[PDB]
Structure 1
């Protein structure tokens, strides 16, 4: 075809008398007899100066080598960026590979390949459509990637003492110029302020006390003052770009620290003339930092206007610890997708999407009446079907335009975005999928949701669920759900996100399956916004020993400080156990940035649903006896008799068995409450009733890390455990007591832990409302995901 200097390209070779062609597919026999046949596309054929007869192999990935594993169609191949030069003598045979393109009438459709597989993120995506003697998509992709990845100097200024100063550089698609701000790891530099690093009990009175035996810092931010690099071979050394920066102080970086900055905006900074030198390699991203007064709009409008937007109004003198005005040199010089929300709940997911500005939920389906009503209260514009999604779908299959109540059913073409959180019962744990199990899955609500996707063929598809959706039955639920989306021709991916990293004071890992129709861009998962406890941000998923991660790059830090229980509910009036007045005055102002977001700027004095469960006299007595010291839970309880009302008694727990593992106490007491503490079988009579210290907690404490957290108080500096449908002191994660008051958290406090605005309405009795709040997708999580979809609508 063309004769380069070192290679001669041919269009077609004869291999054992059979022609082979550019465009053709080929098999190569693996050395490892256990591997599937290697299959490739021939992208070039040539001879080298060395007499070797060669081809370039753009390898395919077999289905069984993707997350899909054995669920995948044997005959479906996927494109991947894996290619290399190979000797023609290795070809085993030519193969037929068909490109199954999405029909032009795809929306109405209620070896081969169709998608490109990204093996690091488990993304199936439409193949590039880009068109051309050697054309190899794999090669083209890596080049574009390398070009994107590498540091490059856009503009040099002048050399001064063996260093070229530049006015502009770039890495990963971001152009950084003089005067721009940059994100940097916490340890890139230090502030000149100095920061100093930060009892026995009677064990018969407190017999369980003995069983009592973290978020990183957010980014450093600095304004670029100069950019200078070294030189190599008389040329710019791009592997050596360095930035000299003006340090910005976050409020908690000044002497005020955190206790002095509880009330400041999470995006407010302080100017400083302190300078730091950093390697370009360490720059984690670019951010906008503007002096408040130069703003053409309001700080709030500027702040909510875009991502990575900070501001300052004062400088901070590290030396006199005073805040003067900033020096002069610090100054400067879409259509909404029509959405169907299945398993709508009270609408946490639709609310986040609405906030993102990308969607309008026109239809919601919610079988449970209270939740359906809650959804209507918040969405006057949506047709809400209080109905089982299965019977609604049958009504549409039956040709009905309307249900019996006059409500207009959504039809093909109506639905542009389909979202929902289908309850996945009876798949928990990890035994293998058996034959009957496949029937269970076909009848399941997750399949019903997929059926909606298949019929309505929406542009975008979102399935949210509990973290363990990705692991149920050895990940077969996840694999079958990805397989269904691929079979339909959808682009799709999955990931786990941690709500805490999107601005809520709660540990809540959720599974998320995204899908996009052939013609769209498949969204990315949103980059963490807030730093959160590392132990709660294990987002990777292992499927058949393969570790999958999402595209998320911020694995250690992030733009904003973590949101605490204090940020969440320090402004709420004091209530008692059983409080039931659903409309009360706040009788105070928002104190935190987080409370200002959720309460609004409008004048608004009514506080809704600050009500809590009326715990029994026994549980109320226990709560009153949990100390207010941070971390306190059931192991702090005193072993005392308490008079309950009516004449009833919380009795003393009696210890009459040796715990061979835990030994005697300092008062010479025994520590076992059953014969199993001595290695023996359980005494049937062992159980003790009505005792301030719950008998079952020492009974099995050793086998469950001492049930840490049960009857536990939230910490002001900490975060909520996963917000559940019914907060119980003794459910597994029972850290549901208020930090100070002798009661469980209120419906509203639970709603604030999910990031619900205060105006957000719920419906039904107190347990109905707890259920609605606990089931929801936190609107700040939904919003972050929504904004990723917004990128795909441009």
Structure 2
């Protein structure tokens, strides 16, 4: 038996009937009392000992949505005076069956604890005080709900941009008062109250209306919305940073504003059925999809076609005649000057009108003037590239031109008029400067988006008549690309035996070792039964390319080649090689790769023949015994350095000793690291031996402290970068704390990874979004670069920095750098490829001052999964790429979760001891490198979060097999150990898309499985299999990774900052232990030396680590900067 009015079961042991006080009088008579007397018209009163009930007398909730379901709810209690704060029945009248509740409402989400609950009846408004004794429990739940909603709203007011893991932490960390009858809130609570908490958050946005992003569109909010099946639109209750800039950087972003700066409704929701004073009827479902789609980018496009190819229109027929004496003969007669009505000579710039279509106007430099054998008057046009046409596009000066590698021969007829083109050469004192017609400053490589300093030059008397930089460039590159023979010995048949050969600038002699693709050669080569679906209801969801092999290494035995005509055929150069085996290439296979050095090989008496084309590169394979420094010293002393100690017999499968023929300063830049963090980037740079961070700016206390702990001789300014620059600029010498502020000339290198959050969107710019970016940390960072003028500059960000705002963020960043006079470029890199068991891409912007060399991007060292290696960037329908050629392969095997952490001693959930013995030697190569040569007793930071008794129970129950997650959890009752019992999941609905179990059991956890609306209180909580997972699984790929364990042969899905099992940071459970990953494990996943110090509480340390640039990637970049210094160091020393 149930209620026809409210639906409560009569058998329900929690049912309670309405009990009235003697003094009970109807509403109109109560709203007549003398006892009774803020901008409203109703009126308003206080109300105590309240009780809400159905027409039949059952006590009822108000949250449950019965008021909306047209059910008349009535209330009774003691009304009081608007100002009377006494929650005791002593000042008012007792009312009974007070008018059907029109609506209920809340107020109090800002500067106050004024969380007031109010009722609206057809007669007056009521501010509820204390409930009645019998109503207390029902109002109790309602209170728990409201309190969570407050915490969430307040947290989001001070922290938009907050991620799911921040929300969960804010909640779990907030101590509820005694008044709220709950110990502490968990993710279970939030999930349980996901519908209420979300709707109140939507309601806060309707009510407190600005122009700001609604709080329900928060990253954490949308994460909750997607995780817990929640219906949006359920309507309810009611009641400017200025970036420190240099004028040059101000103007750049100020002109873009004054120049280039100028509906799929759901139908179904309650906002979509709400007409119409009111302007906002904004669909919340559309709002989410839009916010979600703003987060994703469009990551296989053809090469961008060269400009000026291209048709041009001929001109004049008046008078064109040579002026003066010829410069030289060649079948061609070169001349310096030429009349075309007016004068024209070598070095003058001309304009050429194309075919009148998409007609900008072509501009070139007159490189040469001559008259061929056919009497045709000619000129060599070395083409310029406009302000637009470069990656910069619209962002550029309509007068700035760029030198490109585009030149062609043309008749003097095609010339329109001579144009004035000025070189905006850097000053005598350029580094100190920070604070009409055509001009050019830099050289543009289309393919790589490299803006660089011009060659300057030089024209010899031997080629003074021809001098084309664009021709010289193509020559050098044709010359370096061609396979040429250095020295030959004695030719045999058609084969000419050689002692040395060359390509790409690399010189290959005999005995030198070589890199080759895995296909280049070969070595001596070598169902499932039914599950108990009662126990595993979710397993059915389980259903429903990996890294290449590192390079083949071979030693050169014979450079034989072939021949065509009479002289040596360069098209055919061949090599006979002694094959080397990597330990994995042996009968050892996977067991080789483990404890073995990444760097070790095996000598083989095997032989192979490959073409010189296939050769990927040159490496150094030495024999272990004939070495003068330690294997470690030799190995960590230069690139492509391999080694062998034994030889492998593929036949006998044995390890014999090898045969006897198998046998045989840098300037540290003064760096300023803005947004320094705990110091990852500085560390890799320090590791490259190219820098010394003397200044670091870090706004967050824990990170700045962790930086100091690792960089003792560094002035760490625990400040906001904007305020720090303002001081220097104001003329200040030291900060408040008496710390010496760096002045112009002090900074040689300025590097930094500003956080996104501000800009952080994909859709087109607008007055609102532009203003935020106009004062972003990217803008503050560019000013630091402007003011300081470092020899080198690095900006680091999330890969998507390159896609944000229709690539406008990247274009304005590059624009700025160019204005300032800097050679600059961008590129994407994958951490994984640099020796870290983690899949993470970063956008990297490189800039170097004129005088210096613009560095190339590092070549990948480790082979990584192709899917993780999409390094290309589309800007304005053009696919940009970096100098990286190793697409594809690499010299070393992939770093795995095993290589990363297999040595660390066992810990449990909530492991709190920061200093513990290792109780074991390193096992992997990577472990050896991160642990050091010198023995250290203390293992620091093998500390992991204390997960709730529910989450802990879940982790214990996730199997150990690779790729096991939530779907593997058993549907069993678990004693949590606090009296609390993790319950079995109830499947009471038909999942129409998923079908029945093998047993014929239902797969439905909510009514929405059947296509009907969600039935609340059909919602389950504190279950081992989370209810929210089956609930939304179908529309979210079954929540694949959730409660999933990292794989030993796998890697980290991303940079983890707060390990949460149903979070947005990928597989976070340890491969074997019933816990989430420890701080130190994340530190290892990042490639931090074990000596690296961290500061603060567990989460501050987790944040520190995950925010960091992995030192291996930082070192890779740092080592490209090494070449640039060494190269510019020698090119300085001369006559």
- Matched-pair contact (CA < 8 Å) for 2:338–2:345: no
Superposed CA deviations along residues 59-84 of structure 1, whole A, max 9, x for unmatched, are 11112111111111111111110111
- The answer to whether the 8 Å contact 1:54/1:85 transfers is yes
Q: Which moved more, 1:203-212 or 1:540-549?
A: 203-212
Matches within 5 A, 1:242-641: 242-332=574-664, 334-641=666-973
Deviation at 1:17, TM superposition (A): 2.1
- SS of 1:447 mapped into structure 2: helix
Q: Within 2, Cα distance between the matches of 1:457 and 1:118?
A: 23
Contact 1:56 1:86 in 2 (8 A): yes
Structure 1 pair 639/164, CA: closer, same or farther in 2 (3 Å)? same
Do the aligned partners of residues 269 and 333 (structure 1) sit closer, same or farther apart at CA in structure 2, a change above 3 Å counting? farther
CA gap 1:660/1:129 in 2 versus in 1, 3 angstroms: farther
Matched, 1:97 2:429: no
* Number of residue pairs the alignment of both structures matches: 787
Q: Please, which of 119, 122, 126 is the counterpart of residue 449 of structure 2?
A: 122
Per-residue deviation, residues 275-331 of structure 1 (Å, max 9, x unmatched):
010110000000001101111111111111111001111001111111011111111
1:223–1:246 contact (8 Å) kept in structure 2: yes
Is contact 1:340-1:364 (8 Å) kept? yes
**What secondary structure, in the 3-state scheme, does the structure 2 residue paired with 1:294 have?**
coil
Structure 1 stretch displaced more, 570-579 or 390-399: 390-399
Q: Structure 1 stretch 37-46 or stretch 582-591: which is displaced more?
A: 37-46
Q: 1:134 to 1:692 in 2, by over 3 A?
A: same
SS of the counterpart of 1:327? coil
- Decide which moves more: 6-15 or 597-606: 6-15
- Classify 1:701/1:405 alpha carbon distance in 2 versus 1 (closer, same or farther; 3 Å): same
Structure 1 range deviating more: 498-507 or 636-645: 636-645
**In 1, are the aligned partners of 2:385 and 2:402 still within 8 Å (CA)?**
yes
Structure 2 spans left out of the alignment, 5+ residues = 1-326, 460-464, 1127-1135
Q: 2:1005–2:1030: 8 Å Cα contact kept in structure 1?
A: yes
Residues 226-270 of structure 1, C-alpha deviations (whole Å, 9 max, x = no match): 011111102111110000000001111111112244111111111
In structure 2, the CA distance between the partners of 1:92 and 1:687, relative to structure 1 (3 Å rule), is: farther
Compute the displacement of 1:763 (Å): 0.5
1:90/1:253 CA distance change after superposition, 3 Å:
same
| 1:394-444 deviation line (CA, Å, top 9, x unaligned) | 111122211111111111110000111101113233210113333221211
Shift of residue 510 of structure 1?
A: 1.0
CA contact (8 A) 2:1052 2:1066 kept: no
Superposed CA offset, 1:329-378 (max 9, x none): 11119221011111110001111111110000001111110111101101
- Larger-gyration structure (1/2): 2
Q: 1:653 and 1:285, CA in 2 relative to 1: closer, same or farther beyond 3 A? A: same
Change (3 A) 1:294 1:95: same
Structure 1 CA distance, aligned partners of 2:983 and 2:373? 93
Query: Which shows bigger deviation, 727-736 or 224-233?
Result: 727-736
Any conservation in 2 of the 1:642–1:651 contact (CA below 8 Å)? Answer: yes
TM-score, length-normalised on structure 2? Answer: 0.68
- Cα displacement (A) at 1:37: 1.6
Structure with more relative contact order (C-alpha pairs < 8 Å, separation 6 or more): 1
For 2:334 and 2:747, locate their aligned partners in 1 and report how far apart those are by CA, in whole Å.
51
CA distance in 2, matches of 1:715, 1:183: 30
Counterparts of 1:729 and 1:176, CA distance in 2:
52
Q: Matched residues in 1 for 2:799 and 2:693: separation?
A: 25
1:698 Cα deviation from its structure 2 partner: 2.7
Deviation of residue 20 (structure 1)? 2.7
Distance 1:677 1:118 in 2: 56
Q: Deviations over 1:714-758 (max 9, x none)?
A: 111111121221121111233010000010010000000000000
| Equivalent pair of 1:565/1:720 in contact (CA under 8 Å) | yes
1:686/1:361 CA distance change after superposition, 3 Å? farther
> Is the contact between residue 43 and residue 56 of structure 1 (CA under 8 Å) also seen in structure 2?
yes
Secondary structure of the residue that 2:908 maps to in structure 1? Answer: coil
Change (3 A) 1:598 1:2: same
Alignment CA distance shift 1:10-1:269 (3 Å): closer
Q: Shift of residue 684 of structure 1?
A: 5.6
**CA gap 1:267/1:672 in 2 versus in 1, 3 angstroms:** same
Alignment check: 8 A CA contact 1:709 1:733 kept? no
**CA distance in structure 1 between the partners assigned to 2:1008 and 2:1094 by the alignment:** 46
| Cα 1:203–1:400 shift into 2, 3 Å | same
Moved more, 23-32 or 714-723: 23-32
The answer as to whether partners of 1:7 and 1:46 remain within 8 angstroms in 2 is: no
Q: In the aligned structure 2, how far is the partner of 1:673 from the partner of 1:475? A: 44
SS at the partner of 1:480?
helix
Say if 1:504 and 1:753, in contact at 8 Å, map to a contact too: yes
In structure 2, C-alpha distance between the alignment counterparts of 1:189 and 1:170, rounded to whole Å: 22
* Deviation of the 1:30 alpha carbon: 2.7
How many angstroms apart in 1 are the aligned matches of 2:1008 and 2:441?
A: 59
Tell me the CA shift for residue 674 of structure 1: 4.0
Matched, 1:2 2:332: no
- 1:64 is aligned to 388
- State which drifts further: 398-407 or 676-685: 676-685
After superposition, the Cα gap between the structure-2 partners of 1:11 and 1:327, relative to the gap in structure 1 and judged at 3 Å, is same
Q: Distance in 1 between matches of 2:1067 and 2:793?
A: 35
Comparing 314-323 with 665-674, greater Cα deviation is found at 665-674
Q: CA deviation at 1:161?
A: 2.3
Q: Structure 1 stretch 729-738 or stretch 148-157: which is displaced more?
A: 729-738
Cα distance change on mapping 1:586 and 1:333 into 2, 3 Å: closer
CA offset at residue 15 of structure 1?
7.2
| Preserved CA contact (<8 Å) 1:123 1:492 | yes
Contact 2:515 2:619 in 1 (8 A): yes
What is the deviation of 1:200? 2.4
Contact residue 711 and residue 734 of structure 1 kept, 8 A: no
Contact 2:758 2:776 in 1 (8 A): no
How far the C-alpha of 1:663 sits from its partner, in A, is: 3.1
Q: How far has the Cα of 1:10 moved from its partner? A: 4.8
Partner of 1:210: 540
Q: 1:679: how far off? A: 4.7
Instruction: Note closer, same or farther for the CA distance 1:697–1:235 as it changes in structure 2 (3 Å cut).
Output: same
Structure 1 unaligned runs (5+)? none
| 1:689 pairs with 2:1021 | yes
CA-to-partner distance for each residue in 1:510-534, whole Å, 9 max, x for gaps?
A: 1111100011001111111111111
Q: Secondary structure at the match of 2:741?
A: coil
Of stretches 331-340 and 724-733 in structure 1, the one that deviates more from structure 2 is: 331-340
CA spacing shift, 1:507–1:518, aligned 2, 3 Å = same
Larger CA deviation: 239-248 vs 252-261: 252-261
CA gap 1:739/1:72 in 2 versus in 1, 3 angstroms? same
Cα separation, partners in 2 of 1:127 and 1:656, compared to 1, 3 Å: farther
C-alpha change, 1:123 and 1:674, in structure 2 (3 Å) is: farther
After superposition, the Cα gap between the structure-2 partners of 1:15 and 1:529, relative to the gap in structure 1 and judged at 3 Å, is: same
Bigger shift: residues 61-70 or 512-521: 61-70
Q: Report the CA distance between 1:12 and its aligned residue.
A: 6.2
Name the CA shift for 1:200/1:73 in 2 (closer, same or farther; >3 Å).
farther
Residue 130 of structure 1 and its aligned partner are, at CA, apart by 1.3
